[PDB]
């Protein structure tokens, strides 16, 4: 709990290049076969995204949320179980917590005492957090079924999410497609919008533990985290009302 495991060590800031990806539907309006111009928070094309991995090391450092988050994970068994957002990441204030039980995503904003590197066994909090109290907010997603067991073949789970807080409005853009690099271009879709209204300056991630303190072994997954900037893109809408292309006004 309070002792760092073998997977925690100083590591170099590796990064990759995201070229096309990072475009999403800026609004809920419908448009087809038109050229639309909009300025919002987007991931610049041909940018530098910080690269992370999990397997003799585990990457879950405290990451500033200031400019937003573009999270893209390449996985089979859905290793990453959720996210942790908040300012101090302690019981002094309220923090957002996202836990995926592989049935219904549980989203709760509350006062949590967070450890340095939260883990999930079944879920066990702690290790994630020791105590919780004094909160009125709770939320749940729709019922579903997902398999957390190991899978074979290629990497069939690519989950690319955009996490942003706009005037207290926390929105989640979601996309899932089969596929150490992603390629291709597709526009993300809106999923969750919660008027939480908290200040999130930093964030972490959750891991799924498997075993036949250090007895639990980390899974095998890779991902990276980008940031958003207020840039103007031209979105290409097709006859079906989807984005097949995007052009960066200044690149």
């Amino acid at each position: 709990q309070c002792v760092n495991l073998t997977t925690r060590t100083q590591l170099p800031p590796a990064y990759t290049n995201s070229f096309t990806r990072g475009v999403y539907y800026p609004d809920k309006v419908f448009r087809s076969s038109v050229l639309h111009s909009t300025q919002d928070l987007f991931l610049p094309f041909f940018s530098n995204v910080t690269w992370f991995h999990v397997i003799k090391r585990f990457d879950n450092p405290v990451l500033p949320f200031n400019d937003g988050v573009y999270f893209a994970s390449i996985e089979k068994s859905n290793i990453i179980r959720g996210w942790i957002f908040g300012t101090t990441l302690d019981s002094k204030t309220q923090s957002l917590l996202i836990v995926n039980n592989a049935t219904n995503v549980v989203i709760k904003v509350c006062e949590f005492q967070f450890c340095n590197d939260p883990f999930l066994d079944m879920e066990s909090e702690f290790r994630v957090y020791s105590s919780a109290n004094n909160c009125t907010f709770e939320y749940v997603s729709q019922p579903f079924l997902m398999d957390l067991e190991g899978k074979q073949g290629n990497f069939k789970n690519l989950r690319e999410f955009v996490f942003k807080n706009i005037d207290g409005y926390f929105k989640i853009y979601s996309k899932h497609t089969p596929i150490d690099l992603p390629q291709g271009f597709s526009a993300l879709e809106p999923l969750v919008d919660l008027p939480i209204g908290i200040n999130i300056t930093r964030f972490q991630t959750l891991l799924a533990l498997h075993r036949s303190s250090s007895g639990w072994t980390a899974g095998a997954a890779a991902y990276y985290v980008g940031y958003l900037q207020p840039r103007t893109f031209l979105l290409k809408y097709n006859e079906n009302g989807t984005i097949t292309d995007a052009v960066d006004c200044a690149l």
């Binding site: 448009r31 207290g168 008027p195 079906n240 009302g241």
Partner: protein, 328 residues
């Protein structure tokens, strides 16, 4: 006469031989479509109003109302209520409004205490037990409890505080049993010299005078923040007309035009969408999932072909961009 239309547009009583554009033919709207989304996911507002139990003046229990549909229409169109009075809004106007946060408490008061619950009220009750704040935007509703909250010879199961060491603020629940101390003689938790006993049991009985009788008071506290409104009240809608020129009144949309079957796909989180012109070309039904194509009502230009008024008054009307079938 279309001949006179040529005179008014030209601002002359002599029209020379030629063709002149006068006005533009258009189809005016007939009916009006009013659509409102369903009231489904109604909210437990009966946990106070119809609740079997209740609380004292200072023990008042609050029920959180958020992310749900609160239907007061049955009550306001009926109103089996003792007295309903409040400031800034009429209670009958609370069922058409959407609010971010809503709170509904439950407590019973004596008949003489009806005036004690008002925004910014002061007295032996308002100040020492419960009262509405000066900025209170909600409304309070009394109800006659003589058939429920009462009891034979009185109700002694709940007590009220006569005195308090300090003035209590609005919207504050103090269950403290602390004894009031008027002088410098320590009370030692009990009444005595320079000490008063603030707690008193309710006399509520159906047979006593109007002065003291159980009256259930539910204070509805409404708060509208910058966040979207998670609690809306009920509203009635009308039917939907198609293939006819009519006015559009929707939840987030208003306009005029005709509705037709739309072949365009839409997202589950979108209601309506815009065309190249930033003008809505389609809308989704609020109650059911469907999309209809919005088209403007038929129209066309009107030109008059007439010879010189000094020659003949014969008139010929040209409808441009309109086939003879759509002229009527």
């Amino acid at each position: 006469d279309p001949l006179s239309e040529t005179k008014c547009t030209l601002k002359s009583f002599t029209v020379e031989k030629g063709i002149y554009q006068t006005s533009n033919f258009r189809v005016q709207p007939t009916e009006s479509i009013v659509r409102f989304p369903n009231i489904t996911n109604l909210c437990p507002f009966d946990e106070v109003f119809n609740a079997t139990r209740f609380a004292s003046v200072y023990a008042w229990n609050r029920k959180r109302i958020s992310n749900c549909v609160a239907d007061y229409s049955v009550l306001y169109n009926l109103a089996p209520f003792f007295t309903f009075k409040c400031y800034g809004v009429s209670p009958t106007k609370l069922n058409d409004l959407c609010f971010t946060n809503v709170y509904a408490d439950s407590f019973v008061i004596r008949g003489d205490e009806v005036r004690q619950i008002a925004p910014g009220q002061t007295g032996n009750i308002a100040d020492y037990n419960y009262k509405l704040p000066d900025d209170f935007t909600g409304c309070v509703i009394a109800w006659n409890s003589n058939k429920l909250d009462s009891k034979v010879s009185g109700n002694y199961n709940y007590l009220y505080r006569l005195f308090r060491k300090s003035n209590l603020k609005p919207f504050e629940r103090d269950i403290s049993t602390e004894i009031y101390q008027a002088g410098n003689k320590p009370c030692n938790g009990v009444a005595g010299f320079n000490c008063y006993f603030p707690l008193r049991s309710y006399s509520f009985r159906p047979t006593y005078g109007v002065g003291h009788q159980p009256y259930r008071v539910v204070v509805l506290s409404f708060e509208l923040l910058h966040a979207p409104a998670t609690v809306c009240g009920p509203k009635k809608s009308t039917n939907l007309v198609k293939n006819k020129c009519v006015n559009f009144n929707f939840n987030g949309l208003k306009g005029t035009g005709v509705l037709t079957e739309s072949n365009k796909k839409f997202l589950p989180f979108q209601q309506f969408g815009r065309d190249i012109a930033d003008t809505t070309d389609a809308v989704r039904d609020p109650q059911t999932l469907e999309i209809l194509d919005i088209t403007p009502c038929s129209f066309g230009g009107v030109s008059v072909i007439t010879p010189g008024t000094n020659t003949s008054n014969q008139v010929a009307v040209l409808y441009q961009g309109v086939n003879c079938t759509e002229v009527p």
